[PDB]
């Protein structure tokens, strides 16, 4: 076996699990004890009256599945590596586990024509409150930012417990402690070098480091379609926009340069081949104004489009990485969608998450666990499928945070 095993799944085994009894699950929140109006009254005087604030929220259950098939003659011959049905079941379960692990991070439930309800569920990236975001603008993670995130969490009556980061960021962070090693003069014969940090002590609690093999950087562009059921490619046109709040100038050395742009069309089945590449030149005074993209749907696609991924290259670079993701306006033939890029995410960067991992903050509700179901016999072929229904819920969005645009050079 040259592929990953069950020990490489981390976030799925740690999140708490609860049972679900419907496709809509509701919960209530307490926001305030009263509005601030002063409490000093005076002798024998009737004081004022306060009121509290409450809210009610809901979450929607989604579905996942896959199908495996084995032919009748294959089940009759002798096999060297054991039974084939058990092997196929194991492969299907492991594939589903990997998909669940990554969907718990990068899911999005607003990807549908017109912004309607999609087929995915929301992940950690979208459920965290936008205020608890720290942008590093393309710089290495240091020890200060951990205290910064801990402060962000604790000022909202939380308690940091875990930090989830990719392996490259872990290696880069551990590299920063190398110049702090010291050797005593009467040296022995043989030493162990290299410093690895597993835990951190902040002014608002203690944090544990949890490297994840399936947490990655921005996805690079791929020239081949992920599925034959993906939609057809379209066209792309780009130029300078008219916005006044773009963040192209936040990079080191400014934001003036030449950038490459591309789009890919997506549905629930897979991803299409990339569109034509467009080069856009940004002057020194245009860093405040965004880049406007015009996207045209394919004319004779065999499957409809649902959302669009935007790819951007580095400043004066050649390789393209995914920086944006949004839904189409219409799925009709020759439809036109417009979008303005404001450089919210830099190309070739990483992302990390920290927050309180307790059942009172985050949980996963299961309508049914992973299970198998047989299929009808349409011929001399044995078929079956594997399913799970569920949705993750975060009760306290501001007891989490995330770092964006982290730079790391470990692999290269």
């Amino acid at each position: 076996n040259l592929s990953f095993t069950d020990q490489h799944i981390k976030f799925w085994k740690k999140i708490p699990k609860q049972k679900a009894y419907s496709t809509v699950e509701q919960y209530g929140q307490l926001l305030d004890y009263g509005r601030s109006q002063g409490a000093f009254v005076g002798e024998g005087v009737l004081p004022d009256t306060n009121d509290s604030t409450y809210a009610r929220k809901a979450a929607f259950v989604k579905f996942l599945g896959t199908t495996r098939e084995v032919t009748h003659p294959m089940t009759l011959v002798n096999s060297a590596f054991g039974n084939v049905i058990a092997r196929q079941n194991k492969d299907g379960i492991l594939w589903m586990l990997k998909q669940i692990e990554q969907a718990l991070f990068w899911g999005d439930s607003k990807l549908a024509p017109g912004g309607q309800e999609g087929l995915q569920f929301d992940g950690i990236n979208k459920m965290i409150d936008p205020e608890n975001t720290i942008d590093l603008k393309g710089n290495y993670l240091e020890e200060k930012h951990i205290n910064w995130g801990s402060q962000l969490i604790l000022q909202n009556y939380g308690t940091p417990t875990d930090l989830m980061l990719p392996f490259e960021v872990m290696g880069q962070f551990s590299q920063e402690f190398f110049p702090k090693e010291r050797v005593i003069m009467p040296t022995n014969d043989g030493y162990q070098a290299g410093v690895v940090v597993n835990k951190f002590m902040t002014h608002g609690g203690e944090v544990d480091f949890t490297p994840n093999l399936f947490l990655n950087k921005t996805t690079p562009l791929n020239m081949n379609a992920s599925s034959q059921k993906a939609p057809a490619p379209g066209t792309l046109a780009a130029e300078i926009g008219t916005a006044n709040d773009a963040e192209f100038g936040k990079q080191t050395g400014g934001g003036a340069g030449v950038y490459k742009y591309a789009v890919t069309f997506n549905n629930s089945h897979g991803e299409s081949v990339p569109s034509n590449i467009v080069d856009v030149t940004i002057a020194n005074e245009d860093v405040a104004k965004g880049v406007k993209l015009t996207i045209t749907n394919p004319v004779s696609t065999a499957f409809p489009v649902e959302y669009i991924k935007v790819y951007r290259s580095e400043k004066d670079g050649q390789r393209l990485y995914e920086v944006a993701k949004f839904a189409v306006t219409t799925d009709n033939s020759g439809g036109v969608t417009e979008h303005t890029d404001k450089c919210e995410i830099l190309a070739n960067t990483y992302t990390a998450f920290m927050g309180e991992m307790s059942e009172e903050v985050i949980a996963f509700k299961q309508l049914t666990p992973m299970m198998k179901m047989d299929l009808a016999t349409l011929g001399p072929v044995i078929r079956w499928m594997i399913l799970m229904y569920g949705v993750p819920v975060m009760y306290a969005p501001k007891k989490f945070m995330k770092y964006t645009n982290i730079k790391a050079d470990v692999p290269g």
Binding site: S22, T23, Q29, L30, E117
Partner: peptide, 29 residues
Amino acid sequence: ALEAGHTVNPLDLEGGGAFRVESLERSLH
């Protein structure tokens, strides 16, 4: 077929959604 949707408003339920009952967690967060 008979499908259970994601409709929240009780006055917009139709089809299989009319058979669903309310599900509320009993702990206040």
